[PDB]
Design an enzyme around this catalytic site. Structure first.
Site, PDB file in Angstrom:
ATOM      1  N   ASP A 173       0.819  -1.210   0.000  1.00  0.00           N
ATOM      2  CA  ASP A 173       0.000   0.000   0.000  1.00  0.00           C
ATOM      3  C   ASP A 173       0.862   1.272   0.000  1.00  0.00           C
ATOM      4  O   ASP A 173       0.642   2.191  -0.808  1.00  0.00           O
ATOM      5  CB  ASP A 173      -0.938  -0.074   1.206  1.00  0.00           C
ATOM      6  CG  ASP A 173      -2.081   0.906   1.150  1.00  0.00           C
ATOM      7  OD1 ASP A 173      -2.286   1.559   0.102  1.00  0.00           O
ATOM      8  OD2 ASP A 173      -2.769   1.004   2.194  1.00  0.00           O
ATOM      9  N   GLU A 414       1.539  -9.862   5.850  1.00  0.00           N
ATOM     10  CA  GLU A 414       0.453 -10.154   4.905  1.00  0.00           C
ATOM     11  C   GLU A 414       0.947 -10.957   3.705  1.00  0.00           C
ATOM     12  O   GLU A 414       0.553 -10.719   2.556  1.00  0.00           O
ATOM     13  CB  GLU A 414      -0.264  -8.871   4.457  1.00  0.00           C
ATOM     14  CG  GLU A 414      -1.048  -8.219   5.592  1.00  0.00           C
ATOM     15  CD  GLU A 414      -1.866  -7.009   5.150  1.00  0.00           C
ATOM     16  OE1 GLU A 414      -2.766  -6.586   5.913  1.00  0.00           O
ATOM     17  OE2 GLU A 414      -1.631  -6.509   4.028  1.00  0.00           O
ATOM     18  N   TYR A 470     -10.080  -6.234   9.703  1.00  0.00           N
ATOM     19  CA  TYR A 470     -10.807  -5.011   9.372  1.00  0.00           C
ATOM     20  C   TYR A 470     -12.313  -5.266   9.369  1.00  0.00           C
ATOM     21  O   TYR A 470     -13.035  -4.928   8.421  1.00  0.00           O
ATOM     22  CB  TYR A 470     -10.309  -4.482   8.035  1.00  0.00           C
ATOM     23  CG  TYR A 470      -8.889  -3.957   8.121  1.00  0.00           C
ATOM     24  CD1 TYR A 470      -8.647  -2.653   8.553  1.00  0.00           C
ATOM     25  CD2 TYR A 470      -7.793  -4.755   7.777  1.00  0.00           C
ATOM     26  CE1 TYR A 470      -7.376  -2.144   8.639  1.00  0.00           C
ATOM     27  CE2 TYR A 470      -6.489  -4.249   7.862  1.00  0.00           C
ATOM     28  CZ  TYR A 470      -6.289  -2.942   8.292  1.00  0.00           C
ATOM     29  OH  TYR A 470      -5.035  -2.387   8.380  1.00  0.00           O
ATOM     30  N   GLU A 505      -3.080  -4.894  13.204  1.00  0.00           N
ATOM     31  CA  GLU A 505      -3.752  -3.873  12.399  1.00  0.00           C
ATOM     32  C   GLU A 505      -5.247  -4.006  12.600  1.00  0.00           C
ATOM     33  O   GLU A 505      -5.773  -5.118  12.614  1.00  0.00           O
ATOM     34  CB  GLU A 505      -3.440  -3.998  10.897  1.00  0.00           C
ATOM     35  CG  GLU A 505      -1.996  -3.706  10.521  1.00  0.00           C
ATOM     36  CD  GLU A 505      -1.739  -3.729   9.027  1.00  0.00           C
ATOM     37  OE1 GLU A 505      -2.710  -3.643   8.236  1.00  0.00           O
ATOM     38  OE2 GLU A 505      -0.549  -3.824   8.638  1.00  0.00           O
TER      39      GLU A 505
HETATM   40 CL    CL Z   1       1.223  -0.118   4.153  1.00  0.00          CL
HETATM   41 CL    CL Z   2      -5.381  -0.276   5.162  1.00  0.00          CL
END
Ligand code: CL
Ligand code: CL
Ligand code: CL
Ligand code: CL
Lengths: 598, 597
Positions: A173, A414, A470, A505
């Site tokens: 990201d 991840e 999430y 996260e």
């Molecule tokens: Cl990231």
């Molecule tokens: Cl995110």
């Protein structure tokens, strides 16, 4: 491999080469034309250390593909030649070629860990040029990973198009900030006998605190070691000692989260002198507990980034101090170096300030399926990162082994750990980390959210399960009742395994200044409700031993339809201003002890 | 007498709101008698609305003087069998009303209703309705405009000559003018009709006695019936004349946040009218403010009627939004700073259970911020006569509202100076005389160094203080704010009577933040309020907290107004700042009754 942090000592010069450097984009001919042999012509100026991408106002520079050349003059006293002269690059992102005058001195792969080279004294003329070529390209062989034929999942278009220019395709990201990220320094040591590495571990059994030492040297000389309190009182010392031994520390004060204590460990070898700060503490996992100094710890904190404006990834010492001050203001005790090793200046400051660190490799993007499987054989298209992944683990542990603040190694972020071949890829890396860490600290990998979470190979490898989840953002968006139910159903599985697990996260994109009393994504109120919903579940699970939000602060990313000028999941803005949820966490974490919560 | 116009079996109700013609006066509109003909070369303006913000013109926003509104009025001749009435709910500030070039009525006062019959003979087959609207303010208007006095909030470092003559508000809020509230035509029977209804209640055990006085014109028979919401008759009296009483067994009382309204139905001849009515008691006893004999704690705000782009204009969706936010936040009350609000808001507060401090237009009665209350001959303020009329008209309009628990006679007048008691005593006497329910009266006290000389001490049932400890004094020194707050409020607490904050706050721009106390940030707004409550929560005579303000609102321009007043807990588009969440938490933990018992 051995990389002691360069410091000014009675035997060691330290000359920072940071400042304004010449800078030129490669146009495809920079190596053919041997630009490193002369002063860069028609160049720009660029600050070092810094990422180069945001310093100017040029999209071509920000989105450059390939090499750039940095250069400065290097005019040093000839009397330095009585010493060993070393050029240390704390980090060059991603790959580097280093020239002194027309001569290639070294090459390095890996954008987030230091490397160094002796300067042969015959190469040092009256006037010298130092040129550093920096490559920004990423692919299936780099850490972090760049996509090759895989499509853009976060930045996809509704209709395909042909890009104007070839560009990197990040499989991660965060924005691909490159350049001379951290300081470049010249240092010296004695030529004939010097200290190359220091390894310290702590023994706390039988109500006796001891420091075990191993001093690695080059040349032949006598070794001495002394341990000193903050105020300079010697509490242990021995001279003409062995390369390995132990020292009892009477009245030992332990390093604790948010209550740091650093001794000064002073070493001599021949004429060489080096001082290492050191905190005495134990780390162990037992049952469902994460024990620091034999007490059950609860992580409170964040995944961070090294990200500030305008230096990008570049070392920013005032903001490092601001960030730690904000963590203590908020009641946090910890963070993770997502998704790459951070600067030594940050790590040493965390030792001084009592901030617990999960130290993570550069291994993000090890995932080709977010038909070739990620961990298929290389010869059939599988990921090509395992060899470099081993080098990163070795180099990270070699750099950070002596930090009290580091309590856990994160092997990857991840990765495709629910697919076939993942265990086989990761088992040698977990074995390597356990072999190489003299303190044998816990190891984890940070787990991608996945439908088949029971097949995550973390279950077979890790000492702590570290989950990125999430519930309420990437699923159950604007349906927090459904988020709570989904969260409880999966986290009850993790709790049933009886091992420590935590969030590394969880979060919701939030644009500061957007509000609604009624649950609405991207508003400050929804960010708070998102976290309240998750904590309704986690506070009932006895094996859930830590909460680290995504993210400490808003940070830059690649462009696309779901990135509102970067990632907006910070509790703080990019300029470190608190959103509503930052006040929510200050209240919550103020009521949660560092030890004994669960 | 000004009953709210409603549709009934004897009364038509025809709203004339919509798109009207509109023309700025250029200095010749009365001379050239623009009202006699269709307005020429005119713009279009929504009615109801303030006109100042609808266009993009500073000359329109900052206009000085008159404007002309106009529409066609083509009505059926068969209405001439009825009495025909034009009701102006509010025209700000002064109005001249013409039908076909005949001046029918004029009105002074921008925030209270007025009406005129249309003489049958004036109604032609086609008619023009023209409303001239004056925006000018001076020493004789409420609110007050400055004449020679200096601009304190909007003063320059270096004097300058203005390009054009402009109003000089002696008040913060923007001087929004125009046809602020609806214009309607209604009818009643010609020969006999109801002009006014007055109701008071007494609670004997669980039986309510409702005393009524029904004012009428003409000769007919009067009847009254009281009905539950579901439609059961609980009391009825026929041929009762003007005055009477009746009793309701096991009466349901109106309570804050738990409203109950009966329907009181009246007949007079052929005329029919229904008034909603809540039964409740109000009394000050010792240091207690008693609603239904229980010690109330006010939680709420000073408001404004202020939205974009209508300015002061009636905005019924936002009224409903605002009450919803009040209930979301845990508030129970507000003050109509600094003018009577629309009847639509007041009737909605009755329906929703929101308590109201009902305030006059008397803001700016202060010439020394020549003495303010010197004789008019010597240059004193010239407002007392109109001030009396405003009190009369406000109480006449709002007397029957259960939600109205206290009258505010003025906001931030020069009450610490000589002559102030002499100015205000007749006005307090008037309010007590005219309110049938004899509700508490107050004035809202300006912050002043000589606070022990505030004539409120001699006049008010409740002391209502506007105080800015930590903003206009002790800014960014909240420890000093706490000490200065405690020193003054311990004086007020020593008087043994109920007192409260009607204003306290800090300008706050949404999106500005700092962990470390910094004026204009969202965090400082919270710390400001925490500091004040540290003091007020320890004082047993402090019976209420109303912040300044519910929401950011427009003001005159100047160096201390960051695009208006930013002391709202909410933005102008009703979004919550950090302090709005602070007060939701705080008010969630404070009961409406028995917090300080
Ligand atoms: Cl990231
Ligand atoms: Cl995110
Ligand atoms: Cl105001
Ligand atoms: Cl104010």
């Amino acid at each position: 491999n051995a990389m002691l942090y360069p410091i000014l000592t009675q035997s060691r010069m330290l000359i920072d080469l940071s400042g304004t450097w010449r800078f030129k984009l490669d146009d495809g001919s920079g190596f053919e034309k041997k630009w490193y042999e002369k002063t860069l012509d028609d160049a720009q100026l660029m600050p070092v250390p810094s990422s180069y991408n945001d310093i100017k106002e040029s999209a071509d520079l920000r989105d450059h593909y390939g090499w750039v050349f940095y250069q400065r003059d290097l005019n040093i006293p000839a009397y330095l030649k009585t010493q060993r002269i070393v050029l240390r690059f704390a980090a060059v992102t991603h790959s580097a070629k280093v020239y002194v005058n027309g001569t290639l001195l070294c090459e390095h792969k890996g954008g987030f860990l230091p490397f160094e080279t002796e300067i042969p004294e015959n190469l040092i003329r009256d006037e010298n040029l130092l040129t550093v070529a920096v490559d920004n390209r990423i692919d299936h062989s780099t850490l972090p990973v760049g996509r090759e034929d895989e499509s853009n999942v976060l930045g996809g278009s509704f209709f395909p198009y042909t890009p104007t220019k070839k560009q990197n395709k990040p499989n991660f990201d965060f924005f691909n900030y490159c350049g001379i990220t951290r300081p470049v320094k010249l240092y010296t040591t004695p030529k004939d006998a010097y200290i190359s590495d220091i390894t310290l571990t702590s023994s706390l059994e039988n109500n006796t605190a001891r420091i075990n030492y191993k001093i690695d040297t080059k040349g032949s000389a006598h070794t001495a070691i002394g341990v000193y309190t903050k105020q300079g009182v010697c509490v242990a010392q021995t001279e003409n000692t062995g390369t390995e031994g132990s020292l009892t520390i009477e009245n030992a004060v332990l390093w604790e989260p948010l209550k740091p204590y650093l001794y000064e460990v002073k070493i001599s070898f021949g004429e060489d002198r080096y001082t290492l700060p050191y905190g005495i503490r134990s780390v162990a996992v037992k049952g469902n507990k994460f024990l620091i100094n034999n007490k059950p710890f609860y992580f409170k904190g964040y995944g961070k980034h090294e990200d500030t404006f305008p230096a990008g990834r570049g070392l920013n010492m005032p903001m490092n101090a601001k960030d730690i001050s904000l963590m203590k203001w908020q009641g946090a005790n910890s963070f993770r170096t997502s998704h790459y090793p951070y600067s030594e200046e940050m790590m040493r400051l965390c030792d001084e300030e009592g901030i617990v660190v999960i130290d993570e490799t550069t291994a993000v993007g090890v995932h080709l399926n977010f038909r070739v499987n990620t961990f298929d054989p290389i010869e059939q298209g599988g990921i090509r990162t395992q060899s470099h992944h081993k080098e990163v683990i070795k180099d990270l542990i070699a750099r950070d082994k002596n930090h009290a603040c580091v309590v856990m190694w994160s092997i990857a972020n991840e990765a495709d750990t629910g697919s076939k071949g993942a265990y086989e890829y990761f088992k040698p890396l977990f074995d390597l980390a356990r072999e190489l860490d003299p303190q044998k600290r816990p190891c984890t990998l940070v787990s991608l959210q996945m439908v088949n979470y029971k097949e995550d190979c973390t279950i077979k490898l890790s000492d702590v399960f570290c989950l990125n989840r999430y519930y309420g953002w990437y699923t159950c968006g604007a349906d927090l009742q459904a988020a709570e139910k989904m969260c409880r159903e999966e986290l009850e599985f993790w709790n049933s395994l009886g091992k420590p697990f935590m969030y590394t996260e969880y979060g919701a994109d939030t644009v500061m200044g957007l509000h609604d009393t009624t649950d609405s994504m991207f508003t400050e109120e929804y960010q708070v409700e998102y976290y309240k919903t998750n904590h309704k579940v986690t506070d009932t699970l006895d094996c859930f031993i830590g909460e680290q939000v995504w993210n400490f602060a808003d940070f830059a990313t690649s462009q696309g339809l779901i990135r509102v000028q970067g990632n907006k999941k910070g509790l703080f803005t990019r300029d470190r201003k608190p959103k509503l949820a930052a006040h929510y966490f200050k209240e919550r974490w103020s009521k949660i002890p560092d030890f004994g919560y669960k």
